[PDB]
Amino acid sequence: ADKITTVPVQFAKGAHSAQLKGSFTGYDTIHYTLVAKAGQTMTVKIGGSSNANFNVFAPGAQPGQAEAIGRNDGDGQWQGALPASGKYLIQVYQMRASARRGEQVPHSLAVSIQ
Ligand SMILES: [Cl-]
Secondary structure: OOOOOEEEOOOOOOOEEEEEOOEEEEEOOOEEEEEEEOOEEEEEEEOOOOOOOEEOOOOOOOOOOOOOOOEEEOEEEEEEEEEOOEEEEOOOOOOHHHHHOEEEOOEEEEEEOO
């Protein structure tokens, strides 16, 4: 019975970044979505619970259906030039061990596009 919550991210007028605060428990996950253009550089940084991880998916790609174009490194961050235009998906999740313990995962996701 796993839940996915989708959170559309829209930058304020004239802004190229935002920070979101969220939380999820166990195997629940959050999909943060963001429309961007091919060739722009996206930077993603996750903070808060050490259990928090993310995968970046290009438009149309769903967890389980295609490979992510990126994920958090050991410092909780990722940066890359975007191959495609459209709505990107940042999947925030925790790994099986702590999911299975039912840990709650408060986190902050900072995303910017330039
Ligand atoms: Cl922790």
